Ligand binder design. Structure first.
Ligand SMILES: COc1cccc2[nH]c(C(=O)N[C@@H](CC(C)C)C(=O)N[C@@H](C[C@@H]3CCNC3=O)C(=O)COP(=O)(O)O)cc12
Ligand SMILES: COc1cccc2[nH]c(C(=O)N[C@@H](CC(C)C)C(=O)N[C@@H](C[C@@H]3CCNC3=O)C(=O)COP(=O)(O)O)cc12
Lengths: 299, 296
């Protein structure tokens, strides 16, 4: 059981380079529109307080250079949707997959395709933290990289990358250009709210560990939903809902460990620590696997 | 630092399925050859692969890209891989090479089932020539690779899950990594060791990021370090390992043998609760290339 990303080939065919003035970043080319962060239209004098509609009215179509590989695509239009710039081009992307734009919930996971100068560099799995950051791996020039999920040939795009907080975590928007979290596309040091641990995911991951032959953390005891939630809130864990209990159903069905039985195991791990033992190789409780992630991989 | 795979699209375009009788596995379609594990021809406790392949003709092999059949016009065996010549050159063939990697080297795995990609993740080849994968029935023939300047270097084809749950396989010339054989038998790997060259890379990563309390005023010979490292279940360093630490050594200004003396102190003295890049455990699945990848 490993942190597994989706195959990224359908996304790689959509990545292009967008340049305006001195600024270069990555864009997503679907059919005849290129999506990229709007701060590509920006110079130094506005980065503390850019009036984006005012900056965009002053740009022409020819101010935008879009490159797909060596080929240049001609911009025939432009518009802005929140923090995302939409550049209409005169060529459809023939590699456009079946796709949707989705806004994910905190605790859900997605694959990031890290790109630089329109060229894909790496792929890895991330979770939308409860404080709406993601713990990613992004360097200078990674803006416009996208995160996505795949099911039955449909790519659901959920994240476009915009910024790295002083603490090294990352922030961005959905593909309608709305930030996850309280962040803003201005050149300032921004702080996130206090993060918490994704409780339903830690439980899913404990179930994955039992599916893969590890049981040392289980115990004889059980707890009520509310008593577990009291202890979990004490340790800055998100609350566990009956919907989460339902969603864990299949995994408890497979292993024959009732959800509130596994909650008792987690409560002991939280109150006692792991004592140097490891679960699935980790010395830390892992919260970036969803129930679906576990099921889809283990079977 | 993340475990980060290479983008998989150039390899996705080369995955097909190969069926013999009712056994289906993954194959790799490059130009007009499809490579796959030879045990696709098996019905297994100790196959006579030479004798089994004599009873097989071109028309016993069903090669499909999706649901499109590619006609087999030739077949041969090279070690534990089957090579099927097909009548169509793969138009998505990337620039490619077959390479045999060394313990410690990392690569991306594209886990496939029935010729269809399922996921991608990074693996490290352990000193006992196993990898810590995520593979189910139907995954044999999935490949591992590195991508460098759009050239895909294929280094791994998947064959086997050991009783302990780790995995074993061949290079693309069909030679197993490790002492394993492609039989339906419980095989045990040798006792594993810590990948020293990669721990050193990780210490360099820490230094690059300002975390350098562990550096000291001593140095060591390679031989002295290796004899001590073996006593702590660490792999000995080779000349090639010292060479691939060069770029990180130059960037930090810390000599490789100086960094070996620093690690030697960590092994004999432990961590003392202090952390290195956030943890009390030393990480051994990032190569020097992985480190400069994620730092620059
Ligand atoms: C005083 O200000 C600060 C103080 C303290 C921390 C700070 N952090 C940021 C920030 O992150 N700012 C965004 C731009 C604003 C307009 C949203 C940015 O820099 N995004 C990067 C990706 C980033 C770059 C490194 N790792 C990434 O993930 C692009 O890729 C586009 O930038 P470039 O095209 O390369 O100029 C500003 C800032
Ligand atoms: C009694 O013997 C044993 C005892 C204890 C442990 C054992 N382990 C194996 C083994 O590994 N056997 C190979 C076949 C031989 C000929 C090499 C195999 O099963 N490979 C899988 C991938 C595997 C499947 C699950 N996870 C994987 O990694 C394929 O994919 C091809 O087989 P399939 O037709 O697709 O099922 C035999 C064995």
């Amino acid at each position: 059981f490993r942190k597994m990303a989706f195959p990224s080939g359908k996304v790689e065919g959509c990545m292009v380079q967008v340049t305006c003035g001195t600024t270069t970043l990555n864009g997503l080319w679907l059919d005849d529109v290129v999506y990229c962060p709007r701060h590509v239209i920006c110079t130094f004098e506005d980065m503390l307080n850019p009036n984006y509609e005012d900056l965009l009215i002053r740009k022409s179509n020819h101010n935008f250079l879009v490159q797909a590989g060596n080929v240049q695509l001609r911009v025939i239009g432009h518009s802005m949707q929140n923090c995302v710039l939409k550049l209409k081009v005169d060529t459809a992307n023939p590699k456009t997959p079946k796709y949707k734009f989705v806004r994910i919930q905190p605790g859900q996971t997605f694959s990031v395709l890290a790109c630089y100068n329109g060229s894909p560099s790496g792929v890895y799995q991330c979770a939308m933290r409860p404080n709406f950051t993601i713990k990613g791996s992004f360097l200078n020039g990674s803006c416009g990289s996208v995160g996505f999920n795949i099911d039955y040939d449909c790519v659901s795009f959920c994240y476009m990358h915009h910024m790295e907080l002083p603490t090294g975590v990352h922030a961005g928007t959905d593909l309608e250009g709305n930030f996850y979290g309280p962040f803003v596309d201005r050149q300032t040091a921004q702080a996130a709210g206090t993060d918490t641990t994704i409780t339903v995911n830690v439980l899913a991951w404990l179930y994955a560990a039992v599916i893969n032959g590890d049981r040392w953390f289980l115990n004889r005891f059980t707890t009520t939903l509310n008593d577990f939630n009291l202890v979990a809130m004490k340790y800055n864990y998100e609350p566990l809902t009956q919907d989460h209990v339902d969603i864990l159903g299949p995994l408890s069905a497979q292993t024959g460990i009732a959800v509130l039985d596994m909650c008792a195991s987690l409560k002991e791990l939280l109150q006692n620590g792991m004592n140097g033992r490891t679960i699935l190789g980790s010395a830390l409780l892992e919260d970036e696997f969803t129930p679906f992630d576990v099921v889809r991989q283990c079977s």
